[PDB]
Amino acid sequence: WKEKKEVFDQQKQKLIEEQKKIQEEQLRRMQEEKEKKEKEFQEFNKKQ
Amino acid sequence: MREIVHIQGGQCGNQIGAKFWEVISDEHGIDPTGTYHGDSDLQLERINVYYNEATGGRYVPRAILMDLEPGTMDSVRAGPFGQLFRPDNFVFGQTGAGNNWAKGHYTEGAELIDSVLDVVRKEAEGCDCLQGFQITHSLGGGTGSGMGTLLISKVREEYPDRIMETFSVVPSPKVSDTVVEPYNATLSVHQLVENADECMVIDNEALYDICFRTLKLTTPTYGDLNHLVSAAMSGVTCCLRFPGQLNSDLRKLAVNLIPFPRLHFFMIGFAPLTSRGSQQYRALTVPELTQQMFDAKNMMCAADPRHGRYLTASALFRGRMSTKEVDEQMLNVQNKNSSYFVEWIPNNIKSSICDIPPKGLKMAVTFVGNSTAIQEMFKRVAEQFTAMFRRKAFLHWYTGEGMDEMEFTEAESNMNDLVSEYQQYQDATA
Amino acid sequence: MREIVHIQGGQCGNQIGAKFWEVISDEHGIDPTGTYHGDSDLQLERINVYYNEATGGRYVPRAILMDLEPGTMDSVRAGPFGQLFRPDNFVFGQTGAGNNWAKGHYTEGAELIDSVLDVVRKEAEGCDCLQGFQITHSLGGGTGSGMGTLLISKVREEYPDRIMETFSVVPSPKVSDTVVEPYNATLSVHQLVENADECMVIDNEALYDICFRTLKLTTPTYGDLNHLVSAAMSGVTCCLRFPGQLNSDLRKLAVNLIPFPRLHFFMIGFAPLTSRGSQQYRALTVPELTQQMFDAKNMMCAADPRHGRYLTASALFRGRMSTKEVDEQMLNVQNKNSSYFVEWIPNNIKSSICDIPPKGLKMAVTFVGNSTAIQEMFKRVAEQFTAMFRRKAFLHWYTGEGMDEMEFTEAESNMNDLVSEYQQYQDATA
Amino acid sequence: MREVISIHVGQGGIQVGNACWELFCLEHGIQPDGQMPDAFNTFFSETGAGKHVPRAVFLDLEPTVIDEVRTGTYRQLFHPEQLISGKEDAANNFARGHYTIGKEIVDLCLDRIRKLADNCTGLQGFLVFNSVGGGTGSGLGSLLLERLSVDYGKKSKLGFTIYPSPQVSTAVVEPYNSILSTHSLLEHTDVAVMLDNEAIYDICRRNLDIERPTYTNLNRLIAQVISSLTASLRFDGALNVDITEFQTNLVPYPRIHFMLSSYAPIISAEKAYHEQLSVAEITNSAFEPANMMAKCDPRHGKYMACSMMYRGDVVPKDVNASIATIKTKRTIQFVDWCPTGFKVGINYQPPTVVPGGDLAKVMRAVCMISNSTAIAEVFSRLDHKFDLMYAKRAFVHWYVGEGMEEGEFSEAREDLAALEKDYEEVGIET
Ligand SMILES: Nc1nc2c(ncn2[C@@H]2O[C@H](COP(=O)(O)OP(=O)(O)OP(=O)(O)O)[C@@H](O)[C@H]2O)c(=O)[nH]1
Ligand SMILES: Nc1nc2c(ncn2[C@@H]2O[C@H](COP(=O)(O)OP(=O)(O)O)[C@@H](O)[C@H]2O)c(=O)[nH]1
Ligand SMILES: Nc1nc2c(ncn2[C@@H]2O[C@H](COP(=O)(O)OP(=O)(O)O)[C@@H](O)[C@H]2O)c(=O)[nH]1
Ligand SMILES: [Mg+2]
């Protein structure tokens, strides 16, 4: 019984982990961009 | 030859000079009676830099002391080494400015300045070859920040080719002793950028921080802050008064530390500094000096130098040491910190060696670095200025003596433009 | 060359260091004033391993002392040889942890550790060729077991190629002085396996057993346990400071005693140990040293080494002796005990000889063996941890400072996995 | 740099504060005038030249006791304006000292607390003393604790409350305000220690052999317990314990922090020296049920955690050898989820004797602070006493007419029922 007890709650925390991981995966995937600052700087440098 | 005259104004400047001249006299072995009692031959070879010669063999500093009230100069005369100053150079008014910049720059300071300019002209016309002038004053006071800065313009108008130094104490927002500090700080910074060839900012807050953390002494006083400022002041011109491996006058530093004519606001620091109880533990070596020299807490300003990138740096080593070690350590301090050094100017550290160390110390270093981190001080000064000016608080005192708000607007705009164009080069890339 | 710096934390670590440095200074003939008064030339050749040089010819240890409360360091300074430590290296807080691991690792230990890391970085960057670091701390306390282990990770992140030693005292269930020992022991073992290159467990119960049975002294005190631990500590690095037939630095032991990167928990022992009344009866010979070296009661841990099989073993002989006798005795101790040595790795005993014996002794041996019998300590620690955790006793103290039960579950699981995979090789056969 | 502030409110609180303050002054060598003819800093403060001022404040609404204090031999010791006194007594009415007259006095006490706290730099926590069965004591203690819990927050507060005896009582209405004050300090105090008078009377009768004791004899024993608890902060010891290192070792859950104390040895000089007073026998006497400082039977419940302090020349190995014997005994059983339950502290300073007192001078002593499940009996009997009179609403009009609401009595009853259910829920095995 004791060794049998040693499994189930831990499996449920991992599933919860999958959704958290999914958000980070998405989050990493979101990416966006920084080109506008570079374009703007290119613009800033040109004025300088 | 190539000597300079000393001019100080205000109470803070007078107190700084009262210790600077004591330090110089102790370095050259001059007794408080003006009689030489030194030990080494080199102590007299270049004494013409700061001291004049009179009959009877005694020496007199070529210093000019000015204030709008007589109390401070009547007090400095009774202090040690107070008799060296020539009584003729003392010029003062009977009214004072009351920490009002307008009174010390338009109404009262304008009429008095003719007498002090007369003695200034007498001192400069006479000397063998002029090198320049050095100015000590505070930006937190009215009479000082007004009369000193107007005198800067008057001197610059007559000697455009000479060099000009200013050691300026700016009011920090942490330790504030006057409520009208932002107004006369902002007004003074406007005029100071246009005429001063070099400017060195010093903050009381940084001096208290240094005294509490590095020296670890219980009760700091103005005498300790003055002593630190005096040691830093003396360190700059040491190689001009003593032989060395690579002599470097003030003009050579001006060439190598100012990339553009409007970027001449430096922050300094002195090493070594150790507590009384730990002065036996430490061993004085070039690595030990250079690690403390670039330490952020060692700067004489509250500005954090790892919040920006150095445009250039300078070091004035003292004592007898090998040059190879100095050069390799300067290279190492620049390879390990490449992120904090601007990349479009390579090899931006200047070094100099003087073979005569300070009395009591075997090695010493004076650091003068031009960094972009100084923007934070002007930012906070302008922030307080615009917080107070929007309600026209305390404005009537200034406007009752011929000044207007237009000169405030122009000063604010020029100061903000300076702040912007000083950081413009921080983001510049090659 | 190839020197190491000393870092200690907590009260137990500070008390261990207070005797370790006394033993080292007595070995090298350094007076409590830092002045050398030794007799032999070899006493100064490799003094750069542990001591720095300062002006005036005195020596200063490169030790860093840290704690969350000032009492222990304010007490160690007044003890003998307490003046050697540089006052600058003393860093402490004003609050303490109260034997709470969370407070000493998340809330209070995180803010303070920057100052101690500054001096640690100062010490390591300067030294000629780094060999590594050695750490003394206790797993039964909060501030120690938290701040020390977080500092281990911070040091490992910056110096991944250097070697790291840890002498760790784990709380035994026999002599228990703190009720919350299992929590901060289990939390610390989780982090310690991931970063420490070597770990050496020491138990107070085994020290009391040794003092009562082998030395047979009536009233043991912490000074005797500290002296035994200090002798064992000094024995490991002896050949790195003195010439010998087969020099073997710490990295060579690391290569030869760790088969797999996660199996680096050793138990040690020192020989000879004799009572005062029987010190004249015994004759010091290599057989007499080796029979006491492998004795089960001589181990510095309560773990019984005949309950498992040695993966490997090491011995560091001291004094001048013949190598043929050492090798034949090592072979004999391995032929007569083949049942307690794992069979798929032949010739699993390492030996080294150093020609300089300890002061007062003609021969000495330090034993470092990696055995599978160490599983019993983690088993009982985890048993107490799971007995206390199932009711969430004392959990609110830890959970009120940002920690959660998930980090407890992960720590328990990783510790049990370590226990299992450490014994996995015990039943492995070729 | 470690400090603690003690609060004394009510007649019993002031009379035990006097008892502890003779003892501290005697232990640190300070004369009753406050003049000595670095350990004092925990309880005292230096005035710059000469006398020491206790970090204590005395509170009472009834002026007789304070006036007695201000005319005795200790008139020169305490600061004149920290002995806050009222004009009208609460007269055993809890509602008076919580709603009517205590509110106008509490502001001055809080101002004094702030003025004392700004002086301390390393404040460990607060101590408070109050006899629970009185109006002003319980009411003002509740109000002060409630104000401090929000003014300071996480600072630790310790309460040495004196609950009424099972059958012996001086008042007739003390169960009401005892229950209300227990309600108030249940959610507001970190540690509460049981101190009922009957157990200490039995201790004096059996050991001290005094057949006619007075309150001073009881207060001296309480003062000795306080000194033993706080010795570790101001004396060097092999195994130190801080105040903040308690809720991590004695308090399994936030609700459960009521524990009962014991002390050993207690013996007179007439027969003390005839027996050796070994550590084993004193640690056996400390665990005897008849030597509990509160009239509760530990044989009726489990133990949760035991924190027990030694002082004198005790050696740790002898302590371990005695903890093992106690674990062996079948009449003392610990809770299932606590494998080890002992926290041990060792100090070197022997207990000090007060001239003309009862206790003799000894070299070894032990003080235990033990948390046990058997404490629920006092709550049950106080609840039974409360219910008998609350059934008929007796004496309620004396409380409703002082601003308290009718329903305030019921919720204290519900909280006691919750506490009793919690104590039963914790003590069952898994
Ligand atoms: N241990 C001990 N208990 C005392 C002492 N004096 C009074 N008590 C207890 O205090 C209870 C009543 O509270 P008191 O302290 O006497 O009076 P109070 O707290 O000032 O409250 P008021 O009656 O309003 O003044 C009694 O039941 C006593 O048991 C003392 O000197 N020592
Ligand atoms: N270092 C130093 N600073 C000083 C001393 N006295 C005043 N100050 C600074 O000078 C500021 C006030 O300047 P003030 O005396 O009004 O200048 P003034 O108007 O020209 O007389 C204060 O903020 C001080 O920090 C001194 O003796 N030493
Ligand atoms: N060998 C030795 N062990 C000690 C000494 N003092 C304390 N200990 C052990 O350290 C443990 C308590 O650690 P602690 O002082 O709380 O560590 P900290 O929390 O970092 O201060 C106890 O179980 C003791 O066995 C000492 O002087 N020598
Ligand atoms: Mg009363």
CSV table of N, CA and C and ligand atoms in Angstrom, one decimal, chain D residues 9-16 59-62 65 89-94 130-138 162-165 168-171 174 177 195-197 200-201 214-216 218-219 222, ligand 1:
chain,number,residue,atom,x,y,z
D,9,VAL,N,2.5,45.5,32.2
D,9,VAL,CA,1.2,46.2,32.3
D,9,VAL,C,0.4,45.4,33.4
D,10,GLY,N,-0.2,46.2,34.3
D,10,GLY,CA,-1.0,45.6,35.4
D,10,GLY,C,-0.2,45.4,36.6
D,11,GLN,N,-0.9,45.1,37.7
D,11,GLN,CA,-0.2,44.9,39.0
D,11,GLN,C,0.7,43.7,39.0
D,12,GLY,N,0.2,42.6,38.5
D,12,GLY,CA,1.1,41.4,38.4
D,12,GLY,C,2.3,41.6,37.5
D,13,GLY,N,2.0,42.3,36.4
D,13,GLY,CA,3.1,42.5,35.4
D,13,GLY,C,4.2,43.4,36.0
D,14,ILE,N,3.8,44.5,36.7
D,14,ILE,CA,4.8,45.3,37.3
D,14,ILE,C,5.5,44.6,38.5
D,15,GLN,N,4.8,43.8,39.2
D,15,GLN,CA,5.5,43.1,40.3
D,15,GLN,C,6.4,42.0,39.9
D,16,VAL,N,6.2,41.5,38.7
D,16,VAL,CA,7.2,40.5,38.1
D,16,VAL,C,8.3,41.3,37.4
D,59,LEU,N,3.3,50.1,32.8
D,59,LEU,CA,1.9,50.6,32.6
D,59,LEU,C,1.0,50.1,33.7
D,60,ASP,N,0.1,51.1,34.1
D,60,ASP,CA,-1.0,50.7,35.0
D,60,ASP,C,-1.9,51.9,35.1
D,61,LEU,N,-3.2,51.6,35.3
D,61,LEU,CA,-4.2,52.7,35.5
D,61,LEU,C,-4.3,53.0,37.0
D,62,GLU,N,-3.9,52.1,37.9
D,62,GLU,CA,-4.1,52.4,39.3
D,62,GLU,C,-2.7,52.8,39.8
D,65,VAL,N,1.0,51.1,42.7
D,65,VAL,CA,2.2,50.3,42.5
D,65,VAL,C,3.3,51.2,41.9
D,89,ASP,N,-8.8,53.0,38.1
D,89,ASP,CA,-8.6,51.6,37.8
D,89,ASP,C,-9.7,51.0,37.0
D,90,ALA,N,-9.4,50.0,36.2
D,90,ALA,CA,-10.5,49.3,35.5
D,90,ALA,C,-11.4,48.4,36.4
D,91,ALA,N,-10.9,48.0,37.6
D,91,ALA,CA,-11.6,47.3,38.6
D,91,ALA,C,-12.1,45.9,38.0
D,92,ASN,N,-11.1,45.1,37.5
D,92,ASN,CA,-11.3,43.8,37.0
D,92,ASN,C,-12.3,43.7,35.9
D,93,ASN,N,-12.7,44.9,35.3
D,93,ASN,CA,-13.7,44.9,34.2
D,93,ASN,C,-12.9,45.0,32.9
D,94,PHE,N,-13.0,43.9,32.1
D,94,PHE,CA,-12.2,43.9,30.8
D,94,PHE,C,-12.7,45.0,29.8
D,130,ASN,N,1.8,40.2,31.7
D,130,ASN,CA,0.5,40.6,32.2
D,130,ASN,C,-0.3,39.5,32.8
D,131,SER,N,-0.8,39.7,34.0
D,131,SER,CA,-1.7,38.8,34.7
D,131,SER,C,-3.0,38.8,34.0
D,132,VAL,N,-3.5,37.7,33.6
D,132,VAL,CA,-4.7,37.7,32.7
D,132,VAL,C,-6.0,37.9,33.4
D,133,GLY,N,-6.1,37.6,34.7
D,133,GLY,CA,-7.3,37.6,35.4
D,133,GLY,C,-7.7,39.0,35.9
D,134,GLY,N,-7.3,40.0,35.3
D,134,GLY,CA,-7.6,41.4,35.7
D,134,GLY,C,-8.1,42.2,34.6
D,135,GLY,N,-8.8,43.3,34.9
D,135,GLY,CA,-9.3,44.2,33.9
D,135,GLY,C,-8.2,44.9,33.1
D,136,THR,N,-7.5,45.8,33.8
D,136,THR,CA,-6.5,46.6,33.1
D,136,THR,C,-5.4,45.8,32.4
D,137,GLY,N,-4.9,44.7,33.1
D,137,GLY,CA,-3.9,43.9,32.6
D,137,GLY,C,-4.3,43.3,31.2
D,138,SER,N,-5.4,42.5,31.3
D,138,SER,CA,-5.9,41.8,30.0
D,138,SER,C,-6.3,42.8,29.0
D,162,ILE,N,-0.1,34.9,33.0
D,162,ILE,CA,-0.4,34.1,34.2
D,162,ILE,C,-1.9,33.7,34.2
D,163,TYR,N,-2.3,32.6,33.8
D,163,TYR,CA,-3.7,32.1,33.8
D,163,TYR,C,-4.1,31.7,35.2
D,164,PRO,N,-5.4,31.8,35.5
D,164,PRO,CA,-5.8,31.3,36.8
D,164,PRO,C,-5.7,29.9,37.1
D,165,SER,N,-5.6,29.5,38.3
D,165,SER,CA,-5.4,28.1,38.8
D,165,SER,C,-6.7,27.3,38.5
D,168,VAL,N,-8.0,27.2,42.6
D,168,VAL,CA,-7.7,28.4,43.5
D,168,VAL,C,-7.9,29.7,42.6
D,169,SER,N,-8.6,30.6,43.2
D,169,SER,CA,-8.9,31.9,42.5
D,169,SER,C,-9.0,33.0,43.5
D,170,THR,N,-8.6,34.2,43.0
D,170,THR,CA,-8.7,35.4,43.9
D,170,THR,C,-9.9,36.2,43.6
D,171,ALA,N,-10.3,36.3,42.3
D,171,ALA,CA,-11.5,37.0,41.9
D,171,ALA,C,-12.7,36.0,41.7
D,174,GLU,N,-13.0,36.3,36.9
D,174,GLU,CA,-11.8,36.2,36.0
D,174,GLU,C,-11.9,35.2,34.9
D,177,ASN,N,-12.9,37.5,31.5
D,177,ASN,CA,-11.8,38.3,30.9
D,177,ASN,C,-10.7,37.4,30.5
D,195,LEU,N,1.7,30.2,33.1
D,195,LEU,CA,2.3,30.5,34.4
D,195,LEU,C,1.4,30.5,35.6
D,196,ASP,N,0.5,29.6,35.7
D,196,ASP,CA,-0.5,29.7,36.8
D,196,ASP,C,0.2,29.5,38.2
D,197,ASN,N,-0.5,30.1,39.2
D,197,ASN,CA,0.2,30.2,40.5
D,197,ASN,C,0.3,28.9,41.3
D,200,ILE,N,3.4,26.7,40.8
D,200,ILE,CA,4.6,27.3,41.4
D,200,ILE,C,4.5,27.2,42.9
D,201,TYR,N,3.3,27.4,43.5
D,201,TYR,CA,3.2,27.2,44.9
D,201,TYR,C,3.6,25.8,45.3
D,214,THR,N,5.1,34.0,49.5
D,214,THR,CA,4.5,35.2,49.1
D,214,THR,C,4.7,35.4,47.6
D,215,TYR,N,4.2,36.4,47.0
D,215,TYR,CA,4.3,36.6,45.6
D,215,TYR,C,5.7,36.8,45.1
D,216,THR,N,6.6,37.4,46.0
D,216,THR,CA,8.0,37.7,45.6
D,216,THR,C,8.7,36.4,45.3
D,218,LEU,N,7.5,33.7,44.1
D,218,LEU,CA,7.0,33.2,42.7
D,218,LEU,C,7.7,34.0,41.6
D,219,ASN,N,7.7,35.4,41.8
D,219,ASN,CA,8.3,36.3,40.8
D,219,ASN,C,9.8,36.0,40.6
D,222,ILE,N,10.1,33.2,38.3
D,222,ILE,CA,9.8,33.6,36.9
D,222,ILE,C,10.9,34.4,36.3
E,1,LIG,N1,2.2,35.3,39.8
E,1,LIG,C1,1.6,36.4,40.2
E,1,LIG,N2,0.3,36.7,40.0
E,1,LIG,C2,-0.3,37.8,40.5
E,1,LIG,C3,0.4,38.7,41.2
E,1,LIG,N3,-0.4,39.7,41.6
E,1,LIG,C4,-1.6,39.5,41.0
E,1,LIG,N4,-1.6,38.3,40.4
E,1,LIG,C5,-2.7,37.7,39.6
E,1,LIG,O1,-3.4,38.7,38.9
E,1,LIG,C6,-4.8,38.4,38.9
E,1,LIG,C7,-5.6,39.7,38.9
E,1,LIG,O2,-5.0,40.7,38.2
E,1,LIG,P1,-4.0,41.7,38.9
E,1,LIG,O3,-2.7,41.7,38.2
E,1,LIG,O4,-3.9,41.4,40.3
E,1,LIG,O5,-4.8,43.1,38.7
E,1,LIG,P2,-4.7,43.9,37.3
E,1,LIG,O6,-4.1,43.0,36.2
E,1,LIG,O7,-3.8,45.1,37.4
E,1,LIG,O8,-6.2,44.3,36.9
E,1,LIG,P3,-7.0,45.3,37.8
E,1,LIG,O9,-7.7,44.5,38.9
E,1,LIG,O10,-8.0,46.0,36.9
E,1,LIG,O11,-6.1,46.3,38.5
E,1,LIG,C8,-5.0,37.6,40.2
E,1,LIG,O12,-5.9,36.5,39.9
E,1,LIG,C9,-3.7,37.0,40.6
E,1,LIG,O13,-3.7,35.6,40.4
E,1,LIG,C10,1.8,38.4,41.5
E,1,LIG,O14,2.4,39.2,42.1
E,1,LIG,N5,2.4,37.3,41.0
